């Protein structure tokens, strides 16, 4: 018979980073195994469509990187913009909303971000070069803004079709129902949740710029990518067999029929080393895939909407996300209502009055040691058992733990402060 | 033609030396020559006007065919429509 | 064959904790601190989640507890007696075996 | 040939993890996805490998 | 005008089983191909950071 | 949108009208305390 239930709460933000994007790479087959050489180049030609094969996999790779952002932050069909006065209930966002007085108007934090994170490369530009994004960095922070705008300004309505204004503390009180909580819990602690709120963003700017590992999943990408392709670059200067590891100085000094055994070694290392590129290419496009993949979903139901999915959107119950751009991929605040200082008080499943046993509609019955109260689950506040607040079904005999108490019926009481008298 | 990852000067310098690998040529008239993040790109007129995007070129520029007669035509695309909210107490 | 960093014992005890977590505090524990709960209560909250009332709990409790105990000897005959029950971790350990 | 299995196992453990949290630690409403019927609550035992 | 609604009920308790982990495989490069032998390695070497 | 009459069936109390930040006057209207006056008020 005990139970304990939250008598205050916390408003918390935590930070998940995913993926989105790898950099896009094309490799020039010929000229990486060849060189311009002429000889080499009639020499490939008798392995048939390697080169063709590993130019399609990349390039399905760069299209499918492009297909993986425009799948994560394109999904929203309008421009959202916030209005001329940002005032929204006291939930101060200038730290997630773009700054207007830098370039590229990316929010604090996004800056931060893309600080934190590290158009001709010279360095191995021997054939291997690098595509752009099809969305530029300000193309991606428009998108986070439409989205925070309309998150925002319109909440849940946003995602399902057209945006519908509602004052910020009532999307509040919506998403708080939502987790099982009644409204005038926000409504009464109002300055207090956008306090912590407030706490919470400052703390997840602090977090970000202090901690050197916060984004190690992105700049892991980039640093994956760098590898494979200095790999890449750095096959070039291996023999595999060949008397020299530079194709010129083969044909410089021997002969043709010499020349073709020679630089016959030296393509079949070096187009083993493409294949063996390209297949790790594909794997980790693959994995990107599925990251940005669980991005796109987690914007949809963090962001577009409310989640009932725990953990999904962080630890808590989940009130609401921010989406952030980052460099090849994307950062998620997820605020969060978590229980806290609990009290342990005595329960029972059913109150007995008249004979019958009164079941709680939307509630947990507790008492304090000398007093019954139906309370809602999630957050104490006691309230008076009546009929108004529980059902009834059956006898006071089948439900085990059931204990005697009143409960209040107001028409019967006001039917005595009416007339019971009669005159 | 979009020549990737180099500049525009470099490649006009190239086609008046007859440099190129490749021996033919786009007219690569004026207003026809446009620098983009991705190369340079020779047949398409560059325009203001932003419009969905249909064949992507990079780094934010598309380029589709449209009647402005016909012709190929470079911009940088559109995200959306905007919508400002009226949000309010 | 390098050894896994969690041994066996550590993975029982992640598995007993949560196990611990879910019968004593139900679904309270995911969310945050651990808060008791009477089981037939939390069992309660739950019927209410799938559209049933606790009435219904409550005045068949010893039937649905009856059931559940006879569901869960199911399972260990069931296992006990299937020898593909496990297959996809079978699987698993074949494979790598095999490519060994 | 390790590489391939290593993202099917991957994909096996994310989604192990995500039945843990929605399943094991809280109760859930996607059909199917905690078994057949409505879910009430699910119980994780440990196993060799999974 | 005709609904079926449920009398009784049944608990049910199903069985799913995931992979999480492989076996974790270390290979010495060197030994598998050249087995201790210096020609070997100094030919293996030609070959790059394979 | 069904606009309905605000009434203490549709609504539930909590608290004074202080906490609430922007909160309006509008009647609540409670049939059962209506319902009294059109059974028994004047008594006979
Ligand atoms: C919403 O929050 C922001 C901060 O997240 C408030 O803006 C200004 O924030 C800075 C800190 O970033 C406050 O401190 C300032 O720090 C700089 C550090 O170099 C210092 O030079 C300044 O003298 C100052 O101490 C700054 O006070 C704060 N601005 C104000 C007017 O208080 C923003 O004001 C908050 N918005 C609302 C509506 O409350
Ligand atoms: C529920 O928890 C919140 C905090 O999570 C409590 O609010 C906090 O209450 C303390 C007082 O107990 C405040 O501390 C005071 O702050 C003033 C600021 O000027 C300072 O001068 C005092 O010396 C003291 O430190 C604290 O600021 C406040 N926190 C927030 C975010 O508002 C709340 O009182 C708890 N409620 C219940 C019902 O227990
Ligand atoms: C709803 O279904 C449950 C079973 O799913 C019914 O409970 C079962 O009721 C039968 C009687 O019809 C019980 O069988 C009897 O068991 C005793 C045990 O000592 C035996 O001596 C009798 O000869 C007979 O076999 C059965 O045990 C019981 N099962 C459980 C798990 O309690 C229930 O009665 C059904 N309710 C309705 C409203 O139809
Ligand atoms: C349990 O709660 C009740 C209700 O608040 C407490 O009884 C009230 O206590 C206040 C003083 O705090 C008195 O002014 C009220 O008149 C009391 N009400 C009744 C109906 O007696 C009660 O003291 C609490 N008991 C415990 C053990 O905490
Ligand atoms: C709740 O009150 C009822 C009476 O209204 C109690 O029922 C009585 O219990 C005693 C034994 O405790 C029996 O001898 C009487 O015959 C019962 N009377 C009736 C009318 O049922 C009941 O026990 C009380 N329950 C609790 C938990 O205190
Ligand atoms: C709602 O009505 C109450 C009265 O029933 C108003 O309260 C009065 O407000 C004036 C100032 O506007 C004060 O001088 C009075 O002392 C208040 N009286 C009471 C009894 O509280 C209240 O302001 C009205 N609210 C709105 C939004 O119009
Ligand atoms: C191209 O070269 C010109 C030379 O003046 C330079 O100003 C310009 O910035 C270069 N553009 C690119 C894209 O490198």
Known sequence: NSIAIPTNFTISVTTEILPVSMTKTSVDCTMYICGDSTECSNLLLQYGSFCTQLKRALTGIAVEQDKNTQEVFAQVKQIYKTPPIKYFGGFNFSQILPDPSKPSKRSPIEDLLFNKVTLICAQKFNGLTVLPPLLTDEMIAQYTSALLAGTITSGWTFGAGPALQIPFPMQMAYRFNGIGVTQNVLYENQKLIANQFNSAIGKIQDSLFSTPSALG??????????????????????????????????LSRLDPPEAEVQIDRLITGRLQSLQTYVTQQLIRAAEI????????????????????????????????????????????????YVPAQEKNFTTAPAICHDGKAHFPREGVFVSNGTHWFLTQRNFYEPQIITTDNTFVSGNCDVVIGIVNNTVYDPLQLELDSFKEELD | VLYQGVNCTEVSVAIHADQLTPTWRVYSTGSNVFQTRAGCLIGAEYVNNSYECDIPIGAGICASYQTQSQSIIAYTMSLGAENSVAYSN
Do not use: W
């Not at chain 1, 992105?218 to 530079?246: C, E, M, P, R, Y």
């Open chain 1, 289 to 336: 895939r599925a990251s940005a993949n669980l991005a796109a979903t987690k914007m949809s139901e963090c962001v577009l909407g409310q989640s009932k999915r725990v953990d999904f959107c962080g630890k808590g119950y989940h009130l609401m996300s921010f989406p952030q751009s980052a460099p090849h991929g994307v950062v998620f605040l997820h605020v969060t």
């Open chain 1, 217 to 250: 999943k992105l700049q892991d990408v980039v640093n994956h990518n760098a590898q494979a392709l200095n790999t890449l670059v750095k096959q070039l200067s291996s023999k595999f067999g060949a008397i020299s590891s530079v194709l010129n100085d083969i």
